[model samples]
Structure formats: structure tokens, C-alpha cells
Target chain A: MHVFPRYAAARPEQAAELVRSNPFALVVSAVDGVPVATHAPVILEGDAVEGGTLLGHMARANPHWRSFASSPDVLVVFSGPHGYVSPTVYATDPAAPTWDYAAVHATGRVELAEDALDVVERTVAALEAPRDPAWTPTPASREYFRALLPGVVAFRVRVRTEQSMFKLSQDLDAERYARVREAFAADNPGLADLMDRSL
Target chain B: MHVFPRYAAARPEQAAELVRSNPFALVVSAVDGVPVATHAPVILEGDAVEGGTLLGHMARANPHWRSFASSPDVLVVFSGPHGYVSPTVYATDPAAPTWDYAAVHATGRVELAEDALDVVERTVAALEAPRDPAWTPTPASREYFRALLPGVVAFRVRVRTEQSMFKLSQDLDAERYARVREAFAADNPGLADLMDRSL
Candidate 1:
């Protein structure tokens, strides 16, 4: 991913936050020099022993993971709120239509994990703990859940580079920026929230 | 990308529709055998003379485009609405957490267009036509826009294969599917709409 200096995040923390907020990422890797992608929930481990890692799992039947068996290099893309920014909001002459978006591209080297169950459990806990009636594997279904674990493959990517772009019209004048944010607030609140945070 | 038989779309038209609706795609290719992805708006040319094509552009300064200068094999990913599916919604005793998503992957060979301005014009028109106060390059900004064209690269990917996954619980029983749809409708409308269309 190419990030212009103006739109690029200044720190890894920014990219980490995007990863944390949007755990479901597009995991891309090359198989025989052909690019393949899988949509999966990737758990970010910012404090990992190897500096940082992205933990994820895929169905064992998904051959996309076979690419990782030999090559560890992968690209995990986390996309945040994105929307079209009409030039009307820009309120400037000669303005052109552009899209406002924020995304993080984490390039890393993946190593398959031996304990698929551990990864599954952690992933479940991370996703479910915040729910009202947190769903956990019931004792009666423990065996059933464990049995399903073998059908999945777990792996962790040691993140080497985290590239991010927060292209929210930071170059716009203050008035135009305010108008764009207001327009987004009315129709695209998610992008508006991101814009507020970016500022 | 591996699509399970049940979740995979049966026709290229299905994936083409997804691509058209979600034009903002993740364009991916391998650079020296390492996969890299770029975020760009790709216009789907379903009625093209060469079967079908995807038109897009990137900043010339972005080295990611250089990979296309040789090997044109690329994967353009169009991700649609996705959301977490609670096991509670399944209303099953042994249900586990899962994420439901819809995505289209178009694999093709890219050929750089000689006229970058044509791609840019079409992209802007396609993006802006749906807006309320549509914006186009004015006579005042025509030269300005053209002057900036030299800084960009335009290309079209001739789609050879299209793979899609509309994993919206199609495998679930009627009762469980209804419950999940109702739950999503109440909370995640984007995903609910996709589920409705999937059904």
C-alpha cells in the first residue's frame, strides 16, 4: 500500500488502533507467485514477544492457507469507515470529487501455530466478552467445540511494517473540513466519527 | 481465495454485481513474489468488448503500480457488508460465534491504458453522477486536472475469473436463518440487506 506522507499515520499506534477496531481483515498472500486473499478476524498482539503479531485462523479446508505453509510473507489489510466526499461539501471552486477513507496495511511473516484450540478460544473470548450475554462454550458442548477445532488452522504473523492512511481531507481548509464533517455526520456518521478522531 | 461450495456464487454475474455496487476495491498483486494491496476505486466494465474489465488508476509515485508494468496477473477484491453473528441469534444450544460477510474476488491481467485522462474522467464521472450536487472538472480546472494526470497511471484489468462468497448462513436451518436475519435487521442493516438479497 502506498501512503502519501500527508495522509500517512505518524506512528504504529495509529495502525494498531485501526487493527483493533476492525479485527476482520483481508489477509493476502502469494501462492506460486499468484496473489490470494482470505477474509478472517485477525487478533492484534501489540505487546507480543516478537514486538508485534497478528493472530488469525482459517478453515482447514481453505487452501489459501497452504500458501503460508512455505512462505510467511503476507499482507493484512484493515479497512475502516469510508465514504465519497462530494465536492459540494468542499465548497470551493475547482474542487474535485474524492473518497475519504482510513485503512491500515500490516505486512508480516506468518508462522503456523500448533495449538488451534488456544487461538480459537482467545478469538472467541476477545469477540464475545463485550456482548450483553457473553457467549462461551458451555460445559455440555465443550467436547463438540473442541472437536471442531481440528477443522481449523491457526497462525500468527510477526508484523514487520504497519502502513496506514487516514485520507480525511486533512489538507482542506478549516471551513471546508467542517462542512465535509457535517455532511458526513448527516449521512455517514461512521466516517464523521473517524474524522472527529483524526482531528 | 477459497470459496466453499455452499457459500460460493454460481455465476459470474453475481460477483459482477457485487463489484459494481462496491467499486472501491482492494487491488492486489505480488511484487517480487510478495503480495501487496492497494486501495483504489475500480470501475467495473461488465459490457466490455474483451469479456469484462476493471478500470482504475493510482499515483505514479506509488511503486505498487510498477508491478503491473510486467506481470499483469492481479486480484481485485470487493468487500461488502459484514458483521458479527451472535450465537444467541442462532437460537441453537451448541452454536458458536461467527462472522457473516459478502465479498467478490476478480482475478485478471492488467493492461496499462495509454490515455490516463480517459480513465480519470470516467472514474470521476462514475463516482460523482450519483451524488446530489454532482461535480465535474470545470474549464477553469481542466488544465489543472490534466497537468496532474502525468503524475498518475491508469490501467484496466481484463477479468478472467470471478469468485464470490456470500456467507450469510445459507447452511443454517430455516428457523436459525430467520432468527439471524431478524437479529441482523434490528442491528446491522447493511448485513441484513445483503442477507435478504442472498436469500
Candidate 2:
């Protein structure tokens, strides 16, 4: 992904926050020159607890995971609410608008976790952390976690290259931006909160 | 992209609709076997028009558009609202819940558009279609379009394979599915409306 300096977000903290909010991501890995991808839920972990390394799993039957010998660096893309920002939304001349959205690209080495206990516990924790207490994961009988491990393989990507793009009307002048923001608020009240929070 | 028979959308019309509604998509192709991607706004033209194609563009400096060679098909991925469906959301014991979402994979021939006019028109139409008559493309001046086109290189992918996956709790039994649907209604009203309309 080529990020022009304007849309580019090099801050690691911003990248992690974007991923935390948009946990569902596209995991891409090239297999012998052909790229295969999987859509899955990922959790960012490390000292940033909520945002660090990406941890996810793939079905063991999927050959895409096993064929990751050539490309060690896997790219995980997490995207958030994106809407078309029309030039019409802006109030000024020289006001060419673009899409306003947020995304995080985490590229790192893909390594499979061998321990069944670690994988099961981590998976449950990663998934359930966002939800309430009533919907917690119950540890399966000793046999349950062990049995499910055969069907699933856990992998961690030690994020080496992290890039974030926050194209949220940053290039536009304040007056034109206020007009666009008002239009969004009038049309999409649901997104008004996003605009307010983003600014 | 793994499409289970149950969750797969067999009709091309369904794929076209999903692509049109969610035009902002990831245009992906392989370069020396590493998956390269660019985020662009896509215009999905159906068979009613000049042979169905996915029209989009990228900044000229962004080489992602150039990576699409003549032989291999390009993949344009359109993703819809996705949220995790907890097992507690389901009513039955046998019903282990899954994620609810929709995605379309458009595989097509990558070709550069002859001129920027088509790209500009299609882009404006996609953005303008849902707005009121008062909010017209009058704001989209020719000079503005011409100036913007230079910063971007327009291209269209003549679609060959259109695959769609609308996995909106369809695999679950009615009782369990309703539970998930109702949960969406109570928890996220906006998402519930979108699911009702699309799913």
C-alpha cells in the first residue's frame, strides 16, 4: 500500500487504536506467488495489550496457512467506517474532497502456536474481552479444548511494519470542512458522532 | 476466499448489488507473488450496460493499478457490515453462532480506461445517487474533475467471476437466527436496518 504523505499515519499508537476498534480484518499471505486471503477476527496484543501483535487462527484444513513458506511477512488489514466525502460537501473553491476513513496495515512474520491450551485460552480471551460478563467463554472439559485444537491452528504476526491511514478531511480547509461536517450530521446522524470524535 | 455452499450467493445479480452498494473496496492483485492492494471507489456496471465491469482508479504515483497484468484475474473485495454473533445470542444448544456479514469477490480483466470522463462520471453517479435532487452534481464541475483526474489513473476490470458471500446468520435455525436478529435490533439499531435491507 502506497500512502501519500497526506493520508499516511506512521504513529504506532494510532495504528493500534484503529485495529482495536476494527478487529475484523483481512489476513493476506502469498503462497508460491499466488495470494490467498482469509477474513477473521484478530486481537492486537503486546505491551499495548489492546494493540500490539496480531493474533488469529485459521482452520487446519486450509492449505493457505500451511503454504506460508515463501512469504514470512503476512499483512493484516483492519478498516473502519468509511464514507464518500464529495467535493459538494465542502463549502469552498479548490475544494476537492476524498474518502474519509481509517485503516491499519500490520505486516509481520507468521508463526503458528503449538500449544493447545495457550491457543484456546488466548482465542477466548481475545474474543470475549470486548463483550460483557454474561457472555464469557467456559473452559471446556479437558478433552474439549484438546479435541478442538486439531481442527484449528493459531498464528501470531510480530508486527514489523505498521501503517495507518486516517483520511478524515484533514486536507480540507476549516470552513469547507465545517460545511462537509454539517452535511454529514444532517444526513447521517449515526456518523455525526464519528465526525465529532474524529475531529 | 472460502465459500461454504450454504453461505455462498450463487446469483450474479446479488454480487452486483453488493458491489454497487459498497463501492469503496480493496482492489487486489499479485506482484511477483506478493499480494498488493489499493483502496478505491468502484463502480459496478451490470450487463444492462456495456459488458459488466468494475470501474475504479488509483493515484498515478500509486503503482498498484499498474501491477495488474493481462493474464491473471484481479480481485475486488467489497465488504459489508460485520459483527460477531455470540453463542448466547442463539436459542438452541446445537446452534453454535458465527459472524454475520456479506462480502463480494469480483474477478475480472484489468484494463485501463480510454479517458478520465467515464471514471469521473461513474464516480459522481455512485456518490450522487443516494442524495437529494437539491444536492446535485452541479458542485462537481468539469474543471474540478479534470484537475483531479491527473492525480489518479482510471481503470476498469471486466468482470469474469463474480462471487458473493452473504453470511448473515442464514446457516442457523430460525429461532436462533431470530435471536441474533433481535439482538442486533436492540443493540445496534442502524446495523439492524442495514441487515434487514441487505441480508
Best by DockQ: 1
lDDT of each: 0.81, 0.68
Full-model lDDT, candidate 1: 0.81
lDDT, model 1, position B22 = 79
List residue ranges in candidate 2 displaced over 4 A. A48-52, A61-63, A69-72, A91-97, A140-147, A183-199, B48-51, B69-72, B91-97, B133-135, B187-199
Estimate, for each residue in B1-199, the C-alpha lDDT of model 2 and write its tens digit.
6676767764546666666677788877766665667788888776421247778877889877777646456777888667778776763343222467778776666887867667867777776777654234454465767767777888888777666677666666667767888998987664466556545
Looking at model 1 chain B, report the run of 10 residues with the lowest lDDT sum. B44-53
- Candidate 1, CAPRI quality class derived from DockQ: medium
Candidate 1 per-residue lDDT, tens place, B1-199, comes to: 6788888765446666677677788999988877889888899765532258889998899998988988569998988888888786776777677889989888888888888888878888887777667777777666767878878898899888777898988898898889989888988898898777776
- lDDT digits (tens) for residues A1-199 of candidate 1: 7888878765546667777778888899987777889999888775532248788999999988877877568988988889987776776777666788999888878888887877877887878787888888777456767879878889888888777899988888889988999988998898888887776
Chain B TM-scores across candidates = 0.89, 0.84
